[PDB]
Write a structure and sequence with these properties.
part of a larger assembly; 6 chains; A mainly beta (38); B alpha+beta (136); C mainly alpha (141); D mainly alpha (131); E alpha+beta (94); F alpha+beta (106); A: 38 residues; mainly beta; globular; RNA-binding; ribosome; protein synthesis
Amino acid sequence: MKVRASVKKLCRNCKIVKRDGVIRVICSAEPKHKQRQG
Amino acid sequence: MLQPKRTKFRKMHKGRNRGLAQGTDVSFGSFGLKAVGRGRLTARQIEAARRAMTRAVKRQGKIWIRVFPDKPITEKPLAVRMGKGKGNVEYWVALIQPGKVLYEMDGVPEELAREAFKLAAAKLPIKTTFVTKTVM
Amino acid sequence: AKKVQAYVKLQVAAGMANPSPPVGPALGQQGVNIMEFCKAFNAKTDSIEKGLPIPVVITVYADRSFTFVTKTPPAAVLLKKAAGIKSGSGKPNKDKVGKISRAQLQEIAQTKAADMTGADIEAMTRSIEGTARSMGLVVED
Amino acid sequence: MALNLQDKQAIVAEVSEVAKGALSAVVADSRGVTVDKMTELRKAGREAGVYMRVVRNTLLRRAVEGTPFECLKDAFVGPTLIAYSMEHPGAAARLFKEFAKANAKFEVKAAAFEGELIPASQIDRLATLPT
Amino acid sequence: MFTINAEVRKEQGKGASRRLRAANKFPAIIYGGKEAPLAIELDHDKVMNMQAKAEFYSEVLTIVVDGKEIKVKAQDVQRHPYKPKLQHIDFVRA
Amino acid sequence: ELLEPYLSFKIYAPQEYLSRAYNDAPKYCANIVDTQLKNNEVILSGEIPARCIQEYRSDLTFFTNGRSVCLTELKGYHVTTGEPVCQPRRPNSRIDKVRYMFNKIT
RNA sequence: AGCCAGGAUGUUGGCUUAGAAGCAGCCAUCAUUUAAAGAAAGCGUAAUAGCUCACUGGUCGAGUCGGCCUGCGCGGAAGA
């Protein structure tokens, strides 16, 4: 998974969460869009 | 890269970048990328930021460049001790004061220009914003 | 009335029997034979004319052939023998390629009304004529 | 959605169609198709023109809002998805029976064809119309 | 709806001007005709939302000071160097 | 101007994979061609250059899961190809007068 | 905000006849039937088909959405 400094929503089904303080972008659609950090 | 066609002098003093900018109002286009940050845009950054903007709006639209370098910046060659004269002008820069309109654009939708100026801003070191030509 | 299964509105001039460069694999893409669009394709075509691209329903079943009700040619190609020029757009408002008149196009519009769906003819009129407007053609009202 | 002017506009427009209206019927296509749009509304074209309004907007504060000024008995028709069907040419025309027959003509459902108001009655299949 | 409440200034200069403009209010002035110029401070937010209409830079305004109403025009105006805010307005008397 | 072989390539694959074989079309220089169903089996008349045709057997072999089958024959010398018009040396030697031909070049 | 509904005939439209068929690029960006529907934002096709969103019904029943300005914080932040 990507761990970029910037984590904007790629697909439409991307959703921003902030688990354990660390911001993440979970995508229920495409597993490639899953990313951390930012 | 933008560069003066012949000048009175080849090298010039560093100088300070103090003060508010004069290019405050939008004067040509309907929009603009005003420079909030205090810096010194090099020629390569203007040509580069322009590319990543002239392409962003495709063949349509019209862009103005409100700044021009006209300040030669010298550099000392690597592994050379201090002294022995002023270095060699390696590149040209334009000093940028806060509130200094950089790029202007017309003939494009407000949102399209809104996206085009995000990319050119991405290319530029100084902090920027977005402005619109208010009638008087 | 069963929904979507295989019916597709695609074929060239109705005078071109058993096509392969135009349609070919497209009509015989399913289990239906290539022969089915020549022996049966002109069984209704001969009654009117030939050389006119007229769409027909192709609701394929497991019963070899299929049920169909032929419809109506597009206004676009109708505007060649009924427009003068065989061309069309490319330059819509950039130049006036051709022109007809509401007295003729409204006159042809109600002919296709067997396929068209409208509460009154006038509507179909401005509809089809506007279709003509898209071609760079401007109606001489 | 556009504000009060437009909602109220369409509603008062519906009220003007009751001023010169007559027989009406219900219809509830929870699973309708545009194919059926070209049956009852093509039938509208078979009657005269565009004027006929299925105006499916039975919000208790929308279509039922135009109810207190015209036909208050239709207030109980309000609940669930409902589309009122007014008429104008031919008093007590055949538009009513076409909902019952059309529903049996591949249309899933039709609000249990309870009908509306001419004798202030209820769900009643009636061929008893001026023919 | 062009009407703005605006008190009379007392301490003019770079000093009180900055204390004032850094208080959600900014200075301005009404001048024109034979009358001597009247220095007039007014609320920021309002006027900031007022320049959102072109009629603010053409149609006559009616600034209310000490009960007395002054019909005016926005002859001149100074934006902030870059921040979305005003700094000063020249209301030439109409 | 370069000219290359473009022999037709008929192929017979199961219809369920027949869409996937269409994906092979984009991956190959060969143009789409008329084809027809044959019971559960499906068939299509291809037409691709011999230079890339050799991998086509591997392609049908992979897409069909070994169920694939195909056949082809050379035809149509006309075709044209790119890019740079590369050519295979060389001619010629073992004959008199070639030195005069070398003289002609300069 | 979620919820089964709907989201059309020619448009195989002229285009360089190999296709561009709402969606490579063109320009046009029709108008009807209408509670609504862009001759279409995305996906998927050799191109279709197909799957979505715009939009609008109803179910539903009270506040909710998007910018601006700023305060203080999180990430970006790895060495013997």
